[PDB]
Design a protein around this ligand. Structure first.
Ligand code: ACO
Ligand code: TPP
Ligand code: TPP
Ligand code: CA
Ligand code: CA
Ligand code: MG
Ligand code: MG
Lengths: 814, 826
């Protein structure tokens, strides 16, 4: 019965020992810590060891300065791996390793002392009380270099950022302190091993003040780099040689939903990066808020249990345990290609900002902090107290600090066009690819007519929207471009129109027809690739990832598709903080494409609008391209121009739903082979037909699918006095092309902007103000024909929709 | 040997769920092969050991193993050893590891009756109407007797209400067979899949009843999750149950339904779970039911999540998780009742993962064998839950051939009743001013400290300055806010105020809660106003909390709270208005549009610190232009007050007008401490809210309105800078008019004020925000149309159009600020 009580004791330490570990350097919770003859008896564990030695191994491993959470991991081999490395008696670090960790603590503290002394308003960014994160990050990067990896990419909030730039990225003081925006900009550097012969690239990504919003952006950036190096999921090796190193705060990590959304991507085929190293700077405070008001779990890291990640809670006043846990984390990530979370328990020495006396809201915590000596002073005293360094060396370490402090002060003192048309053979090849099935492949009987109709369209014309899209993407791959397309149910298409990936009816094997265009007819690679995935049910993390992918590989054609444009508001922080504004704020460029299914069809307020008015409001000084094409060929030329123009700026496309199957919304072969993108479109009766522009007295200006309904109504009552002009590119406004087009209708007495969207929505709120100002001689007196202003994108009734739709058409021809 | 048994017991308790027969489709064939953790020989035990008695009590290994396999490896997969509380693990362990008595024929027939009613509802829906395939509950009808068991167990505990939140799948079935709404109400004259509902559940075999309600929601999956919590917490606060109540029953239960792909992918799930035990947000535990049909439209679970289960996020708060086979309605009803008992015993969330399937395509244009041929060849060989359960009861000898025929007659009768009832239906088809003594009382309250309380030395001058302000005037913004909230509590109103660092204030200005310098005890001065001077309660209360670092779940919760208690004054404060875009879905889908779409009314207040001060693009704008764009047909009130007294009257009008519509307030940062931005006692005691404000030199001074030839129209703090510049140059030819209420535009008040300046030759809208931001994009178009005789020729003075709310440089901000001021006086 005694040997059974030992087995239960071993399991208790492994499962719950972390609840008794001395992880808090402030020891705020006192309640945390609240036979002898058997201790010298040998037990079978098959090895023979004395109970006192088994128990000492269990206390050192699980109840010392490291709290290990791993028995929640479903993989027995991963539990076994941790168990073996944590439960073995490790050899104490060498005097050289201790002196090295100490120099890193000196550099970090001197940097902090310099920041608060030289400049004013720097208290918010203070890393004082959390300096151990610097030798911890150093150990992460050094262990990644020891595995021979290519790059470590960092994402972090603002606390200690300039310290990371100087002591991790290795940026010189002259570059750091030159003129805050500096706390949001990206950076690149080279890490050179101190005791090794390896080097590794280290980069820091740009981010807003919005905590954790950069998390899926880092993942996308890293995946794009991993794809370029041919490493990982889409590569020839399983090394995933680009490592994401993600920094967090404790209140942010537990409260922001994007954390869970980004963790949810960790093992997905379209989003995995081979595991992220997470470091939580757990100072047990969020501004003035205590952890008991910030989370409903024991640890701020408990969300990471969602993906069975091992969690290490470590005492920030023990830099050796912190460096050891950082190296173990890199080894686990390398061995299992899964996320590791390091929870660094520390404190925030100063107030949150200049106007904060933290004892006002946390008197107890700050009476304990005011008793604490720095983790530098503590570690140097601890090295003297254990006899690991001499009195001369301890003075030298103290003199290393002074020289590090003097150096910053003295260095900062010293400082003080292309064609998008393809040939008919290119169209024919993309059409033929849909029927070039692998041997023994069984196409689903309802998919086979789609493949046959695409080979017919490629040779005979009447090209629909869905095929035009694949013609654009396919021709880019054939030219050597990497095309990454993703979104909810994007492989088949929400409207069963895409079939980018087709599934074997008998085996379930996937076949990608456009991937055949990555190989030239002679069998040589084009250098191009088609990467198409079904995303998780996320908007915030998925849009963030695709923006990040566009930044990681500026040469890639990156498209994200919303199920319906109505759901993109779930990614509003990414749209506001990165996509629309990254270039102006940080000089960070993104070529990301957002495909937003849009249009009034009676399917309700959440299946009608991509909120065109919101994107037009965000636009300024050529920041993005915003388009609503009405024709398959014009969409094809829009995608090819974006993929070939070399302008790294986002593209927002309001794509159709029912217009995908509108038989009037088809294009001729010549529209792809002898044309280009047209920002302004006239009716074909005036450009190709026998229509007379001089009979026109009423001009209707519009965009999107409503054109076909207006055109049908004009044809039904032969209204030669009315002309319909489409604005395909909403932003930047094609001022030049718009003026030249309207000049061709000299007898126009009235002009109307016609739209399906309510008066406070669509293009009218911006066009109604801009068009009379930009073109006063053409648009003074411009009137609106639309739905009435609504507090929702549309009515919930399809009957109300139909009445309103007819009301617009009747007003336009009244 | 005894050690190998202890390891075997732990293995079943920890990992037995990985071998449980939970999938009714049995898609993964490798699931039952290769499981050494649970294997006897893989632990160092033989067939000889099976008849040996072990200490666990003394029981044979064979009995230990039969108890473990029945409890953890049959149709229920139990995850609970991740729970840090040993008493919670032991509670589950005892109830799961005991041999339960088989359900009575009466209970079995009742479960079969609920499946009969659910399948008959689903059969009518697909047969009578077209375009109903997307709402089909076919393959998941066991969720109806499962929900019935939840509600019946809540009634058995004597609870007051169950509030349901769910996506659209099986919604009308829930309305008919759970909420109990009649078919005449359900199928009269879709929006019906988004509307709220209330009903009464009456126990079948009991004498208790319980209220059952369904909340309104958009098509945005999981967005309603925090809204349900807020709504339920508001109801708990009214019933004096829960966290802010004398009874610890939490007698209003949230029943939250989910889909498997959405539960794993939506971040709002984790944000809402994170609220579960917070003093300001806890609802005594939510019962979660995931309708896990192992598909999300055309997407397989392996592309939807990075974990074994769609429910693994719930481990974040140490919630017990039950994976149950949807083809076993008895195990499903049993797990539902156990979930209610756990929630009652520990006031924590329970998650039920119901494994089932989706019989049809996702919608009308879906042949799901196109994308999932294997799954759908397996679904095609499966007969429904009702039929399979009828056949099981037959084999077990629990019912006879006559009884099964009678159950099929019950199904036919339920199916005829829908068709018939719908056939018949088709055939017939205020003053806001307070007395000075009220102000003095709120001022005195700041110094009426509890005996032995130690005020922080930096907080004491704030308390003393508030008593001086209350008696002498020069009332600042921060105190005016508390004067408004305090006077409402004194009148009997419930005031709920929350947000990031809201107790102290982001700008160290509020001090709604003060903390004892020696003990950490909290003291709320405004809570003293809930008691009249005679000692009787006013009926009012002050509920003030620091929120978690969430925008989406926190704004969702506060919107839900205003719906749950329409009589409450509910305010949510952003740290900076720049971070409210994290809650855009709640703003777009509930706040701005809930009234027009569902008839659901909300009185929620959003306080959004706003203003250009050189702190960068994320500490400058609450995006006024976005709220003005969302506004239509008086859906919300949008204001930017420039004065403490005008803010006070704005909050009191909102709290007393009886108009259940949201209020959006763009609040100050540096203007909190602007010494010109103070109000007199008479502004609170003898005035009201002013939507349009003139300069005091014209209304109270010796200023001449007839000398004015240039009129500057503006809003917010820039008024003080424009006023200082006018005073500096003695510019009598320029007048500054403020628009305090941006939406609905005060058309009449604006027209009457401008008519008082007859010699105006030019008008300008002046703003700090870029030309594509602030009020200009809407005012520039609206003002010349609504008031053509006053605003034709209206010009803009602002910052240039920008792709961000401001520049990152405070030097660039300062130059642009001066440029605006010089253009206005050029
Ligand atoms: C709509 C036209 O409003 P106007 O007459 O131009 O402006 P004004 O601000 O004076 O509003 C008039 C009245 O309606 C009330 N009111 C105006 N807007 C609102 C609102 N958004 N919410 C509640 N009450 C309002 C005012 O408080 C005022 O009440 P009063 O009778 O004490 O003067
Ligand atoms: C999405 C978002 N919400 C709110 C804020 C405002 N904010 C800035 S710092 C802070 C508290 C941060 O707490 P924590 O994550 O523990 O980091 P710490 O400052 O302690 O390192 C908040 C709420 C923000 N920057 N982002
Ligand atoms: C936030 C959001 N994003 C996307 C959609 C579009 N959408 C509707 S149903 C669906 C798949 C749902 O999967 P699941 O949660 O498993 O539910 P099920 O339809 O299987 O019951 C999606 C992505 C949505 N309604 N909401
Ligand atoms: Ca481009
Ligand atoms: Ca109101
Ligand atoms: Mg913190
Ligand atoms: Mg599903």
């Amino acid at each position: 019965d005694k040997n059974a009580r030992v087995i239960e004791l071993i399991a208790a330490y492994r499962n719950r020992g972390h609840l008794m570990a001395d992880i808090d350097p402030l020891r705020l919770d006192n309640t945390r810590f609240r036979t002898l003859w058997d201790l010298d008896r040998e037990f079978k564990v098959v090895q023979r060891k004395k109970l006192r030695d088994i128990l000492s191994v269990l206390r050192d491993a699980y109840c010392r300065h490291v709290g290990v959470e791993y028995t929640h991991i479903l993989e027995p081999e991963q539990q076994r791996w941790i168990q073996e490395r944590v439960e073995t008696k490790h050899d104490k670090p060498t005097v050289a390793e201790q002196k090295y960790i100490l120099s890193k603590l000196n550099a970090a503290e001197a940097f902090e002392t310099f920041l608060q002394t030289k400049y004013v308003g720097q208290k918010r960014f203070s890393l004082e009380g959390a300096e151990t994160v610097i030798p911890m990050m150093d150990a992460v990067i050094d262990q990644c270099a020891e595995h021979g990896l290519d790059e470590v990419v960092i994402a972090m909030p603002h606390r200690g950022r300039l310290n990371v730039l100087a002591n991790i990225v290795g940026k010189p003081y002259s570059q750091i302190f030159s003129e805050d925006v500096k706390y949001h900009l990206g950076a690149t550097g080279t890490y050179i091993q101190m005791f090794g012969d390896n080097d590794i690239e280290v980069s820091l990504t740009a981010n807003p003040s919005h905590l954790e919003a950069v998390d899926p952006v880092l993942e996308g950036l890293v995946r794009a780099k991993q794809d370029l190096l041919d490493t990982g999921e889409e590569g020839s090796d399983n090394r995933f040689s680009v490592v994401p190193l993600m920094l967090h705060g404790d209140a942010a990590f537990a409260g922001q939903g994007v954390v869970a959304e980004t963790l949810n991507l960790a093992l997905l085929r379209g989003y995995r990066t081979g595991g992220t190293i997470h470091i939580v700077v757990n100072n047990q405070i969020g501004f003035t808020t205590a952890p008991t008001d910030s989370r409903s779990s024991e640890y701020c890291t408990d969300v990471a249990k969602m993906i069975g990640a091992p969690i290490f809670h470590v005492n920030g006043d023990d830099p050796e345990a912190c460096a050891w846990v950082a190296r173990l984390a890199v080894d686990f990530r390398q061995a299992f290609k899964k996320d590791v979370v390091i929870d660094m328990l520390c404190y925030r020495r100063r107030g949150h900002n200049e106007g904060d006396d933290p004892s006002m809201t946390q008197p107890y915590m700050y009476d304990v902090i005011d008793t604490k000596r720095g983790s530098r002073k503590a570690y140097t005293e601890a090295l003297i107290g254990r006899g690991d360094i001499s009195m001369k060396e301890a003075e030298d370490a103290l003199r290393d600090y002074q020289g590090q402090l003097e150096r910053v002060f003295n260095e900062v003192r010293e400082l003080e066009k292309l064609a998008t048309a393809v040939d008919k053979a290119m169209l024919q090849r993309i059409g033929d690819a849909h029927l070039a099935l692998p041997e023994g492949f069984t196409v689903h009987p309802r998919v086979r007519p789609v493949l046959e109709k695409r080979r017919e369209m490629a040779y005979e014309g009447r090209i629909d929207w869905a095929f035009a899209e694949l013609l654009a993407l396919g021709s880019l791959i054939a030219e050597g471009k990497l095309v990454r397309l993703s979104g909810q149910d994007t492989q088949r298409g929400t409207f069963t129109q895409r079939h980018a990936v087709i599934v074997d009816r008998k085996t379930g094997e996937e076949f990608t027809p456009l991937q055949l265009l990555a190989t030239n007819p002679d069998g040589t690679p084009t250098g191009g690739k088609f990467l198409v995935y079904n995303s998780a049910l996320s908007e915030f993390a998925a849009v963030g990832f695709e923006y990040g992918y566009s930044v990681g590989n500026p040469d890639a054609m990156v498209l994200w598709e919303a199920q319906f444009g109505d759901f993109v508001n779930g990614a509003q922080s990414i749209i506001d903080e990165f996509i629309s504004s990254g270039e102006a704020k940080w000089g960070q460029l993104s070529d990301v494409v957002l495909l937003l299914p849009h249009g009034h069809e009676g399917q309700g307020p959440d299946h009608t609008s991509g909120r065109i008015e919101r994107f037009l409001q965000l636009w300024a000084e050529g920041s993005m391209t915003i388009a609503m094409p009405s024709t398959p060929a014009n969409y094809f030329h829009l995608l090819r121009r974006h993929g070939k123009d070399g302008i790294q700026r986002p593209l927002i496309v309001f794509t159709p739903k029912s217009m995908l199957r509108n038989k009037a919304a088809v294009s001729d072969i010549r529209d792809f082979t002898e044309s280009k993108f047209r920002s302004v479109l006239e009716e074909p009766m005036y450009t190709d037909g026998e229509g007379d522009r001089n009979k026109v007295t009423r001009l209707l200006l519009t965009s999107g699918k409503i054109y076909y309904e207006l055109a049908a109504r004009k044809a039904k009552e032969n209204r030669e006095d009315v002309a319909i002009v489409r604005i395909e590119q909403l932003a930047p406004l094609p001022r030049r092309r718009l003026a030249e087009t309207l000049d061709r209708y000299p007898n126009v007495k009235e002009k109307f902007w016609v739209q399906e969207e309510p008066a406070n929505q669509g293009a009218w709120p911006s066009f109604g103000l801009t068009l009379p100002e930009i073109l006063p001689d053409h648009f003074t007196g411009l009137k609106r024909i639309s739905r009435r202003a609504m507090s929702a994108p549309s009515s919930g009734s399809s009957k109300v929709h139909a009445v309103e739709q007819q009301e617009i058409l009747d007003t336009a021809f009244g």
